[PDB]
Write a protein that binds this DNA or RNA. Structure first.
Lengths: 102, 98, 201, 147, 203
RNA sequence: ACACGUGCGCGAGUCGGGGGCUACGAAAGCCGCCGUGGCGCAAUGAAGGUGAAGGCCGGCGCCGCCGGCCGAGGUGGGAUCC
RNA sequence: GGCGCGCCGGGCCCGGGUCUUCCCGGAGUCGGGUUGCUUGGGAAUGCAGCCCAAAGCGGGUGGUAAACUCCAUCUAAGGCU
RNA sequence: CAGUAACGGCGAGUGAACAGGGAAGAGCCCAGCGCCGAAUCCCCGCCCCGCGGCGGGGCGCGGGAAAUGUGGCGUACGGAAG
């Protein structure tokens, strides 16, 4: 009942043991730093929200998140970028209702 | 084989020649056409020199460009099979014995 | 206009091709120039290998060539680490470094580590001021016997391992090579749709 | 040799072997592959059937290295390994089979064309044809897969 | 550092704060000439990134470029050709308005050398760019080993040869499967290699 | 570039043409762990792919598979040879 | 003119590995829609105009449009050689 | 590779890339982030060398640029501090 290594199928290719070298330092670009989180949080207070974000808020407020996704998808560009944007404007909108009652 | 090999290898030591790309084409010549009792050859543009209205393009015209001007991308060199080049030296050597 | 049965054929000669005809009367003059510039380089590096620095043992990508081994850009930073050579010191003793090379396998790593161990042993290192040797160099009797290596240093020869005639077991006789391949194909092809209908169940 | 050519023999004639009636004019059928569906239809049908029309699927970034699978037939299988191995295997009593790594010699798939000489083999190939396997088994041998 | 706060502020251009600043400046700039010296970088931050330092011999010209596409300069729309080349209105220019800005700066300032450039505002009719210029003959630049690459005659008029960052964007160079058409030095070098018969001496 | 014919070399191979090594010579000679590579040695399907003789005699008048040995057709016409 | 022996002039007063604690990025730009040109690049290879316009376990690519995921692979919008 | 994948009144025609062998082979620097009393640079006057590639060393509450950021360390291969 000996199997052979096969150039095709489910677990294919030459027999190779995989070494765990530390992942490259370029891989962690765009990873959210504790300080740079503070700076975007800081300027969010100073600047506020863009007119397309403020309209996206007021479609999430009345509960119309598909029509808020279809809105942002037109404005910001793609579907992955819109789905992220809506879930950020759903986070900073649900955070206002926490600050509302107390 | 000795003739064949000698008469392909001797072409390889041979420098290119060509007529110049511009030879006979450095006129602004234009045919007069019919109605002028002259032979529809491109004639040179007018002016009190001997060339004015002569015959400037074409193999046959004095001055003029030669027929099919010689290019430097003529296939000058010939490659012989190494086995054949060897079987020419062998032959050339064995002939020297007698 | 086509005469009879002949090949249907499309010359790419409709552009003004005669303006851009590259001829090769340079060829023997080029070769003389490259050879003079190679001898002139080799004389400038008096003791050092004329070919340039050692390259790593490297598998060729894509299935066509992965049975072959070629010289690489340079040694990986993790091949240099295990060898224990500082990446900036490596380049000064004639070792190719490219920091772009990963190491997915331990075999490729250990081949190229052992490759550098061999180099560091053979390499005769001259002192910086020649008149006074210091602690981290080669002995003066070796320095006199140090002269150029022509062709690529430790040339990377492709070698297949010897195997002797084995008696064929009943496992090897019973193994269905063709049936095993055709099963494997259908399993990889029908993995996602089987798992789709295990979900439905 | 310009002297061996036909043009030398045609000095003194008139038309230069190109016809007195139907002159050697420039391009009297159009240029290149012109009129393949019109005035040259019969040539492109009598001699090039299939020339016009689409058939099959486009494959945009085709990389010829992926589909690379150089095939060896069983009839030339013993040329991959030295003639010394073929001799010494038949002599030696053990029943020990020499190993033919088809991948080392530079082939991947073993196809089953010819008669294979009756002595055991261990063919280390990447792929096998069905008939190729049956012959190797039939002679009394193993088909090892490799990657 | 302040520069990261200035960076992320400039990324919120639809914010009330930056909309006001981008409108009151884009007003200010219209009333000046199309090619005038700014006394400092309008964006000190962005100019830092693009290589502008705050030392003697670094010059900054605010130049405005008139905005829109490129209509074919042909008398009364008569392109005397085949219907393919009848196009006159909806045609576009191969280089960005920023690259056209860098080269109006670089031509006028024939002595100076265009390092780089950055956006500072757009009306419907005018885009406004600051262009970073360097004196190759000021001893601050001429004795700095970091910046004595612009002091060499290879880098005369980078803007005129698409060698500034904005000019390089027009050239379609870059590594990989999308940029095959500019393999070699350039689009012209690619074309040249491919449209040459190599007639080897033997062949 | 192609086709066919012909001459020559080698021949299931063949070819360095690119690269490299060593007055006429920018030639010639050499490389073989320089055959990378081309073309040939395998075809066919759009593709996934698959991929190029068998018979007989026995262990269970017919058995899936155990083994055994000979083993790459047949007819007709066929220069030559016997 | 280019190389080396020795005396002097003044710069230059520098390393490595392990161990914790910290730090880490280029925006009217990516990207999107549309238009024109461009490409072998085909539901759009590249380039540009105008409109929209980001993100940060993000972003780009992974040659068929799209959603859901899984992986692989680089870190664009700054520079030199 | 390759007249190939692809393009094209899918006609005429057009038409690259990867891998592979070689020629050559060499790597690097900022901004940002942060640390160091602007630790930085330019120009005038004097003196002493000194150069037909105005450079070196003194002297001066001599001037100026520069905190709207100069220099050193440091840049994705990670870096810094102790």
């Amino acid at each position: 009942a000996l199997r052979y290594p096969m150039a095709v199928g489910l677990n294919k290719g030459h027999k190779v043991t995989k070494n765990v070298s530390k992942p490259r330092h370029s891989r962690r670009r765009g990873r959210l730093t504790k300080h740079t989180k503070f700076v975007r949080d800081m300027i969010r207070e100073v600047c506020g929200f863009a007119p397309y974000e403020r309209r996206a808020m007021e479609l999430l407020k009345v509960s119309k998140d598909k029509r808020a996704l279809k809105f942002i998808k037109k404005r910001v560009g793609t579907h992955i970028r819109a789905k992220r944007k809506r879930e950020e404007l759903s986070s900073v909108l649900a955070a206002m209702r926490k600050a509302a009652a107390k | 084989i000795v003739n064949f090999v000698h008469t392909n290898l001797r072409k390889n030591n041979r420098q290119p020649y060509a007529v110049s790309e511009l030879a006979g084409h450095q006129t602004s010549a234009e045919s007069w056409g019919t109605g002028r009792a002259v032979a529809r050859i491109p004639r040179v543009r007018g002016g009190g020199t001997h060339r004015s209205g002569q015959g400037a393009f074409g193999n046959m015209c004095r001055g003029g460009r030669m027929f099919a001007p010689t290019k430097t991308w003529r296939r000058w060199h010939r490659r012989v099979n190494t086995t054949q080049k060897r079987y020419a030296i062998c032959s050339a050597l064995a002939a020297s014995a007698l | 206009a086509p005469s009879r049965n002949g090949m249907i054929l499309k010359p790419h000669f409709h552009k003004d091709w005669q303006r851009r005809v590259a001829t090769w009367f340079n060829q023997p003059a080029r070769k003389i120039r490259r050879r003079k510039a190679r001898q002139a380089r080799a004389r400038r590096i008096a003791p050092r290998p004329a070919a340039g620095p050692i390259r790593p043992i490297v598998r060729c990508p894509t299935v066509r060539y992965h049975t072959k081994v070629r010289a690489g850009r340079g040694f990986s930073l993790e091949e240099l680490r295990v060898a224990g050579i500082h990446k900036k010191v490596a380049r000064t003793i004639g070792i190719s470094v490219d920091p772009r090379r990963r190491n997915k396998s331990t075999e490729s790593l250990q081949a190229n580590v052992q490759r550098l161990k061999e180099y560091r042993s053979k390499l005769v290192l001259f002192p910086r001021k020649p008149s006074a040797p210091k602690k981290g160099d080669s002995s003066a009797e070796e320095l006199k016997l140090a002269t150029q290596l022509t062709g690529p240093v430790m040339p990377i020869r492709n070698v297949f391992k010897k195997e002797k005639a084995r008696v064929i077991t009943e496992e090897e006789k019973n193994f269905k090579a063709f049936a095993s391949l055709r099963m494997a194909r259908a399993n990889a092809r029908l993995f996602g749709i089987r798992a789709k209908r295990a979900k439905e169940a | 040799p310009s002297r061996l050519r036909k043009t030398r023999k045609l000095r003194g004639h008139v038309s230069h072997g190109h016809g007195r009636i139907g002159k050697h004019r420039k391009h009297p059928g159009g240029r290149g592959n012109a009129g393949g569906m019109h005035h040259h239809r019969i040539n492109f049908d009598k001699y090039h059937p299939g020339y016009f029309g689409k058939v099959g699927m486009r494959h945009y970034h085709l990389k010829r290295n992926q589909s690379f699978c150089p095939t060896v037939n069983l009839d030339k299988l013993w040329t991959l390994v030295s003639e010394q191995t073929r001799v010494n295997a038949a002599k030696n009593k053990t029943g020990a089979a020499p190993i033919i790594d088809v991948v080392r010699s530079g082939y991947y798939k073993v196809l089953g064309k010819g008669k294979l000489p009756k002595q055991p083999v261990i063919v280390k190939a990447k792929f096998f044809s069905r008939r190729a396997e049956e012959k190797i088994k039939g002679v009394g041998g193993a088909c090892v897969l490799v990657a | 550092g302040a520069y990261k706060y200035i960076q992320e502020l400039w990324r919120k251009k639809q914010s009330d704060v930056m909309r006001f600043l981008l409108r009151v400046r884009c007003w200010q700039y219209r009333q000046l000439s199309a090619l005038h010296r700014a006394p400092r970088p309008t964006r000190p931050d962005k100019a830092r990134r693009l290589g502008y330092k705050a030392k003697q011999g670094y010059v900054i010209y605010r130049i405005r470029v008139r905005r829109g596409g490129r209509k074919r300069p042909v008398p009364k729309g008569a392109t005397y050709g085949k219907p393919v080349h009848h196009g006159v209105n909806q045609l576009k220019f191969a280089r960005s308005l920023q690259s056209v800005a860098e080269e109006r700066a670089g031509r006028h300032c024939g002595a100076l050398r265009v390092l780089n450039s950055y956006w500072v505002g757009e009306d419907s009719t005018y885009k406004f760019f600051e262009v970073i210029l360097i004196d190759p003959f000021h001893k601050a630049i001429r004795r700095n080993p970091d910046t004595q690459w612009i002091t060499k005659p290879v880098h005369k008029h980078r803007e005129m040869r698409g060698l500034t960052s904005a000019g390089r964007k027009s050239r379609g160079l870059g590594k990989g499967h999308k940029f095959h058409h500019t393999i070699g030095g350039s689009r012209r070098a690619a074309w040249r290699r491919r449209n040459t018969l190599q007639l080897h001496r033997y062949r």
